[PDB]
Design a protein around this ligand. Structure first.
Ligand SMILES: COc1ccc(C(=O)NCCN)c2cc(C(=N)N)sc12
Ligand SMILES: COc1ccc(C(=O)NCCN)c2cc(C(=N)N)sc12
Ligand SMILES: [Ca+2]
Ligand SMILES: [Ca+2]
Ligand SMILES: [Ca+2]
Ligand SMILES: [Ca+2]
Ligand SMILES: [Cl-]
Ligand SMILES: [Cl-]
Ligand SMILES: [Cl-]
Ligand SMILES: [Cl-]
Ligand SMILES: [Cl-]
Ligand SMILES: [Cl-]
Ligand SMILES: [Mg+2]
Ligand SMILES: [Mg+2]
Lengths: 228, 7, 228, 7
């Protein structure tokens, strides 16, 4: 690893600075270095990892989207395809790096539901990003589905319906159903059941937990509004 | 496009 | 150069795609490659060069700003200084690359006022960016001032007061006076004289030129509002 | 901070 020279704690500290500076590539490299130290991640540290790579891959997806749309209009010189391929190859590289970190060795060492569901959701997310770009695509979709399903089974056994990780997992799994798996009815059914079960569990939450959970439930409702 | 879990 | 393999025209085409995709690092590398072909740049091509590097350096300045402020609060571990230094070193590298392109060999081949004033303004801008970060600083400031002054003398002889390059040059030169050279009165006097002379020349412009010029004159007025 | 020439 490139960050083998820096203390674990200094990598985490600099990751938070990079976030403040909105330098998400630096942030990702710092958190990649922290992971490669070999110790498990705290809840805070896991979210720093996710925030960093989600911003990096997010800019890549947005760019791939623009170029792919330009490419498809020109099909209704080689430059548009070439550069779209470059961004695409770059996006796949970031996804493979994240999946590499999860496979070596964050997932196998994650024993608590909070950490294991988080990493398996993340694994589903980044196979979903690869899927958005693939054509191979069937196998990537199955890998995404498998990771999401494993995470769902654990969250249903081990987490209350208003747990933000469980809600975010269900939200993203329903996006997978709707956008990737051509299962819009499965997407709608999962969003409804997720929303309703969380609603019934809100009475157990504190003021702050209530805010955290309802914020994510609103995304479920927004999608249902767009989907129906 | 469908809305994802936010950070 | 890294782009020695690609056609000049393909570099320009991909620069415009990178702009649409908001991939300004790619855009800068593409335009750097186009410059290194050795041919002079068209008006459009010059603005692509400026847009690309201005976005790259802009993100660096914004990040350096955040970290430097964090650093100074911690002075009223080495991590904050180290990472601020990394971003700073990275910012100086981009400025040196641009100044390198201007010195090899865009400026010496720029004969028209439109191109020569543009490159000399650009040279002043990127010495100003180095100045924001320097402490050496006196020499960098003088280099910025010298480039700006040379550009001003040519624009006054060769351009009408409403020329957008002349207005943008005067605007940025006044920012230099106010923010770098501790000459707030010189900044104010230049903004007033620039605004007034352009006002008198608007009657010569078309509808579209009128819009382009007044848009930049508003920035002069905004600064004067903040400065007085 | 003072306003620069925009793109
Ligand atoms: C829901 O996700 C989070 C949970 C907790 C924290 C956090 O500060 N924990 C302190 C020790 N437990 C955090 C920080 C983030 C950031 N820097 N963007 S996300 C995020
Ligand atoms: C004022 O600066 C400009 C002038 C002209 C053009 C342009 O299209 N010229 C076409 C041939 N003359 C341009 C394109 C930009 C861009 N891609 N962001 S800036 C910019
Ligand atoms: Ca390694
Ligand atoms: Ca139906
Ligand atoms: Ca070279
Ligand atoms: Ca005075
Ligand atoms: Cl290694
Ligand atoms: Cl590495
Ligand atoms: Cl390695
Ligand atoms: Cl070379
Ligand atoms: Cl090179
Ligand atoms: Cl070189
Ligand atoms: Mg150590
Ligand atoms: Mg050629």
């Amino acid at each position: 690893g490139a960050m083998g020279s820096m203390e674990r704690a200094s990598l985490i500290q600099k990751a938070k600075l990079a976030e403040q500076a909105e330098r998400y590539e630096d942030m990702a490299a710092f958190m990649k270095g922290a992971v490669e130290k070999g110790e498990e991640l705290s809840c805070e540290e896991r979210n720093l990892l996710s925030v960093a790579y989600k911003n990096v891959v997010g800019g890549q997806r947005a760019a791939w989207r623009v170029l792919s749309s330009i490419e498809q209009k020109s099909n209704e010189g080689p430059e548009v395809r070439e550069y779209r391929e470059k961004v695409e190859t770059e996006l796949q590289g970031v996804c493979d790096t994240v999946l590499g970190l999860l496979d070596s060795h964050l997932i196998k060492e994650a024993g608590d539901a909070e950490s294991r569901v988080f990493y398996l959701k993340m694994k589903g997310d980044y196979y979903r990003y690869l899927a958005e770009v693939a054509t191979d695509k069937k196998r990537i979709i199955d890998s995404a589905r498998s990771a999401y399903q494993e995470a769902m089974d654990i969250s249903k056994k081990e987490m209350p319906p208003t747990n933000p990780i469980r809600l975010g997992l269900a939200l993203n799994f329903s996006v997978f159903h709707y956008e990737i798996a051509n299962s819009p009815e499965e997407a709608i059914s999962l969003a409804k059941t997720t929303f309703d079960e969380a609603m019934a569990d809100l009475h157990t939450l504190s003021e702050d937990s209530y805010k955290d959970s309802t914020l994510i439930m609103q995304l479920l409702r927004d999608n249902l509004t767009l989907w129906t | 496009r469908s809305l994802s879990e936010r950070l």
